[PDB]
Write a protein that binds this ligand. Structure first.
Ligand SMILES: Cc1c[nH]c(-c2cnc(NCCNc3ccc(C#N)cn3)nc2-c2ccc(Cl)cc2Cl)n1
Ligand SMILES: Cc1c[nH]c(-c2cnc(NCCNc3ccc(C#N)cn3)nc2-c2ccc(Cl)cc2Cl)n1
Ligand SMILES: [Mg+2]
Ligand SMILES: [Mg+2]
Lengths: 347, 347
């Protein structure tokens, strides 16, 4: 016996039928914007879990819970239970624990002046791209894709997207706030104030992450709000008439300095695989509608290695789930199935 | 000892030799790097701000730094240019008065000791700040980065001086400008909303935030993320009205805000907080750009009247710093107020 907390918590799936859930071994993981996350152990199953404790304010719409219950995908963190706690009201999401973040694993390689082996980039990025495909097919936008919100198991190579405190259904016509993502991963439309944006802000953030896994540092590290547009334009180059028109037409007579775009191949370190570069170029676009959809990205030639039936993880294990698509996932573009699920993986 | 070739800030536009010594770093940031040195010539302590600039971009810091002379603004003594690594870039070395402390440092000191700053010094510091804004807004210029980190001050004489003109730029009616601009705690709401047509009213908002934070003992609008800014504001100002929204940005006209009722101003600060100060913030931290006072209007306010009292003295028994020596320029904003701002006491 040790200190066991017992609470009455409602399943994440299912209809509001609470049950008693005991857990033990509570440790704090971290602390921030997201609230507080504890690690704990389910007494029942022995399994490890993250408990995310958000302070909530009834005055405001707090759509995290609604969305967490809505969804179920191997590349997204699972809500097991949730429950309420006591100065005011606290939401307690009980989620899948996962041992590491991309941020940290990347930071490790960075501190070792070592490039993360591409096979992991391909694994990690692919899986992110499925998690978006999925949330986006409900027209939900995460609006905080960054490395800290990408969890991974290093041994199993499984990635899981997390933190839906800023996620939200985006509806055509409705305007929404444009101070959203983290700075480095904030897409340029949002920096221009645009309220007419789409899902494809998350594809920009994804490209920023890919780039960062190939460089071993962030591709656009703005010193300050303003440096961010600088550090972007220094590589993307100055935008067309119609790129500005396509991000936010208020800037149509802004007069940016004229910078020639730094071609992609000279952005990346010299032994970098083309298809990495190629993909990267089709995510980090000014015109948002020019950026790949998440499913188009999964089908890119940069992930071909993963559809090889012989492929394995470096530690000798099998690759995780990569081809167990549902019709939800493929709604955006169902014929891609033929490329996405290779024959050996087909039922 | 190092000796470089450099150019007097005020005049004349002509290189001369300048020897300084005992360099030591003071800190790094978006601002570049600052060092302390002593001029070998006249013995003096000096701040050497060294930024890296990309010659393809309008780097308007030095022109602005040259057309300023004012007691509550850092004096630019000399400037020079060291060479950069890439051919597109270069080092600008502003050489300014060394002021020995900063407001961010002195509030974070008085707030470690779990208490408020002597209300005299809130009075003194905001006055001298609001003064320099008056001076610079008069030439069209907007600082665009008003925060306690950028307010140097001498603790003995209480002389405060505005600094870092890296984001500073002359606004000009009709032109569009980049919304994503100030430091985050102090970003005026219209900017959060994406307004490309903001005025120098933003710097007043920002000064409003600093007023708060000296009387609150810590920041008044601390977003733990970008989205939480507009939240932590609405939590104090309550929901904006269709008129207030329309004043900030036409596009959020249709945006479904939470209906939140304002938090009474006396109820925001400590119960023993002077109500003149409270009236002041009420008028500085208004959603609507125009409804915010000007800096000149702010200097001439009940809260600062204590400074005009002939019998006022610094609680270290010293005389005050030179609060009343206004120019014609400083007053252009609205010269009637000279009736209030300069008392009988001087003249
Ligand atoms: C200050 C700080 C900020 N970020 C972290 C941090 C550090 N290490 C790890 N390791 C993975 C631990 N397992 C976890 C963690 C969270 C979830 C879930 N939902 C599932 N599993 N995770 C995080 C982390 C990552 C995302 C969030 Cl929303 C919160 C945290 Cl604390 N610390
Ligand atoms: C990391 C960090 C961030 N801010 C600081 C910091 C700490 N201590 C002090 N003390 C005042 C020293 N004298 C000075 C300093 C600067 C100037 C001028 N222009 C004139 N005089 N100043 C700063 C500071 C404040 C504004 C700027 Cl732009 C730069 C710095 Cl380093 N350190
Ligand atoms: Mg930079
Ligand atoms: Mg908060």
């Amino acid at each position: 016996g040790s200190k066991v907390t017992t609470v009455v918590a409602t399943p994440g799936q299912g209809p509001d039928r609470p049950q008693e859930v005991s857990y033990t071994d509570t440790k704090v993981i971290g602390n921030g914007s997201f609230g507080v996350v504890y690690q704990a152990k389910l007494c029942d199953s022995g399994e490890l879990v993250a408990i995310k404790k958000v302070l909530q304010d009834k005055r405001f719409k707090n759509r995290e819970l609604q969305i967490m219950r809505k969804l179920d995908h191997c590349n997204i963190v699972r809500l097991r239970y949730f429950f309420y706690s006591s100065d005011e009201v606290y939401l307690n999401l009980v989620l899948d624990y996962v041992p590491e973040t991309v941020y940290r694993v990347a930071r490790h390689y960075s501190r070792a002046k070592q490039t993360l082996p591409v096979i992991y980039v391909k694994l990690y990025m692919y899986q992110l791209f499925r998690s978006l495909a999925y949330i986006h097919s409900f027209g939900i936008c995460h609006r905080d894709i960054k490395p800290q919100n990408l969890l991974l198991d290093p041994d199993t190579a499984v990635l899981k997207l997390c933190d839906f405190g800023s996620a939200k259904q985006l509806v055509r016509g409705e305007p929404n706030v444009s101070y959203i993502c983290s700075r480095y991963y904030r897409a340029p439309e949002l920096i221009f104030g645009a309220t007419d944006y789409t899902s494809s802000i998350d594809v920009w953030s994804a490209g920023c992450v890919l780039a960062e896994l190939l460089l071993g540092q962030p591709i656009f590290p703005g010193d300050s709000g303003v440096d961010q547009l600088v550090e972007i334009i220094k590589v993307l180059g100055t935008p067309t008439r119609e790129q500005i028109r396509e991000m936010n037409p208020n800037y149509t007579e802004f007069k940016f300095p004229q910078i020639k775009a730094h071609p992609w191949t000279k952005v990346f370190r010299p032994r970098t695989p083309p298809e990495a570069i190629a993909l990267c170029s089709r995510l980090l676009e000014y015109t948002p509608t020019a950026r790949l959809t998440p499913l188009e990205a999964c089908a890119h030639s940069f992930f071909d290695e993963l559809r090889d039936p012989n492929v394995k993880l470096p530690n000798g294990r099998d690759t995780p789930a990569l081809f167990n698509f549902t019709t939800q996932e493929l709604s955006s573009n169902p014929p891609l199935a033929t490329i996405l699920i290779p024959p050996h993986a087909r039922i």
